[PDB]
């Protein structure tokens, strides 16, 4: 437990810096403000909030092995975590659908999407995530029934997560599993379109002059998110379907593995040459 504090401090600093750099780069320069960039700033803001007000308290609670702030602050922390995770995951699905519309139908992309519709979509996503997180927690619709939960609820030095099976399943389904199928279908269709378009160039001018460019990008984009957030949303359902199967430390480790995905996001969605020039400017 010597270098763990340094490692977590480095994680927090990297998350914060990688988010603020993108935020100021988008806000300062007018040429980067497009329809697509409005989703990236929302994702960056969600990741920044998660890195600011979620992981430091968790790190402190892990180090001290106790909670010294009260019940209200522990519940507030948990709601914030569920909200920032839920509001961060769905922006990826929104971006995937945007790319699907842009590539599949190019003559209707300009008319289909406008600034007002983008703002409406962002507001709807944030409202849905907030409704998922803040309401069922503060109203106490998730607390368990066994004696361990009752013992931990009635004292101010215990901060542990306990939920019933139904709420865990509902939260997992709304937060993770639903966007996954949409993203997979969208990216498969985009890959099909890219391959069908690349075949025509070979058919036309092949003798005067594959699919290794789309494969790398799609693999990175899908694999990072899937490997970061897949095990947690399996063990979350497993440990409530049949208890006495998963240890706590495994749960915390997988949840924290999911956490760091917020730091890898700017390294994937901000590699454009314009973004690189803007970063080099500052």
């Amino acid at each position: 437990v010597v270098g763990m504090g340094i490692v977590m401090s480095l994680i927090v600093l990297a998350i914060v810096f990688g988010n603020v750099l993108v935020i100021t780069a988008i806000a300062k320069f007018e040429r980067l403000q497009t329809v697509t960039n409005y989703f990236i700033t929302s994702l960056a803001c969600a990741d920044l909030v998660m890195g600011l007000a979620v992981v430091p308290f968790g790190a402190a609670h892990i180090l001290t092995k106790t909670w010294t702030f009260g019940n209200f602050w522990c519940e507030f922390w948990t709601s914030i975590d569920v909200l920032c995770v839920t509001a961060s995951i769905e922006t990826l699905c929104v971006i995937a659908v945007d790319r699907y519309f842009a590539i599949t139908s190019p003559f209707k992309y300009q008319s289909l999407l406008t600034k007002n519709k983008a703002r409406v979509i962002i507001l709807m996503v944030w409202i849905v995530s907030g409704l998922t997180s803040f309401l069922p927690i503060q109203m106490h619709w998730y607390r368990a029934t066994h004696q361990e939960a009752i013992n931990c609820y009635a004292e101010e030095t215990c901060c542990d997560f306990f939920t019933n099976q139904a709420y865990a399943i509902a939260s997992s389904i709304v937060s993770f599993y639903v966007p996954l199928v949409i993203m997979v279908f969208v990216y498969s269709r985009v890959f099909q379109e890219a391959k069908r378009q690349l075949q025509k160039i070979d058919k036309s001018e092949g003798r005067f002059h594959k699919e290794h460019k789309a494969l790398k990008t799609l693999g990175i984009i899908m694999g990072t998110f899937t490997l970061c957030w897949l095990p947690f949303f399996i063990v979350n359902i497993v440990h409530v379907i049949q208890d006495n199967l998963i240890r706590k430390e495994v749960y915390i480790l997988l949840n924290w593995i999911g956490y760091v995905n917020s730091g890898f996001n700017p390294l994937i969605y901000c590699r454009s040459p314009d973004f690189r020039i803007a970063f080099q400017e500052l």
């Binding site: 003559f107 379109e193 005067f208």
Partner: protein
């Protein structure tokens, strides 16, 4: 005082509202530039497409298109071509049956068209705009090949060692000699294009006559691929 300021603000608001209304219809239209050599046949093409400067409005599949021809003005140094660096595509019309005639004394008109296309392709401002190429006057070319004391070898030396490509789809009524001559002219233009391409723009060759009615379809399908390839390259999947 504020009496004039209120009226000024109202006028500015009305102007801004009108500009916002006009931007929506401006951003949802496609512009094309029609280029061609002398006596190529671009006027017939634009006349069938419709049904100082020459402009045309036409709509296909609920998509607004704007094709405009530029006056020749007897200009050999095109200083006005830097304006047209934001068009969707460029339509190039060439007469493939004009290999034998000579423009007063110079190379044959086919060689003149090749020089113009090479200069057009390698331009500082047109380093992104794609080209749609129409090889007009197909029926006259067949008559010259099928009969007459005119040989492409005499005017073009490279035709001696040229062989028909395997990946060809000749028409059922095409003669074996005509297919050889039609393709040789086609790869002359493609050869210039492939070498200088940065992968930012491509060339689309077509065979055209003065009677076919699918030309407006070819512009529609080819202009759809131009935008789609742009999006794929931007997102780094092409």
């Amino acid at each position: 005082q504020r009496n004039e300021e209120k009226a000024q603000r109202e006028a500015n608001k009305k102007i801004e509202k009108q500009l916002q209304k006009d931007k929506q219809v401006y951003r949802a239209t496609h512009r094309l530039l029609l280029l061609g050599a002398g006596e190529s046949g671009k006027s017939t093409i634009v006349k069938q497409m419709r049904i100082g400067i020459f402009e045309t409005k036409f709509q296909v599949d609920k998509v607004n298109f704007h094709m405009f021809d530029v006056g020749g003005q007897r200009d050999e140094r095109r200083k006005w071509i830097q304006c047209f660096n934001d068009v969707t595509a460029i339509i190039f019309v060439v007469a493939s049956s004009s290999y034998n005639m000579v423009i007063d004394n110079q190379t044959n008109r086919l060689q003149e068209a090749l020089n113009l296309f090479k200069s057009i392709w390698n331009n500082r401002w047109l380093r992104t705009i794609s080209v749609i190429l129409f090889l007009n006057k197909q029926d006259l070319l067949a008559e010259k090949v099928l009969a007459g004391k005119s040989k492409i070898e005499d005017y073009f030396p490279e035709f001696a060692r040229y062989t028909t490509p395997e990946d060809a789809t000749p028409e059922p009524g095409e003669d074996p000699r005509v297919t050889r001559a039609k393709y040789f002219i086609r790869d002359e233009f493609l050869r210039i294009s492939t070498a200088s391409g940065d992968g930012r723009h491509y060339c689309y060759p077509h065979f055209t006559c003065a009677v076919d009615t699918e030309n407006i379809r070819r512009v529609f399908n080819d202009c759809r691929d131009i935008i789609q390839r742009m999006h794929l390259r931007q997102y780094e999947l092409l």
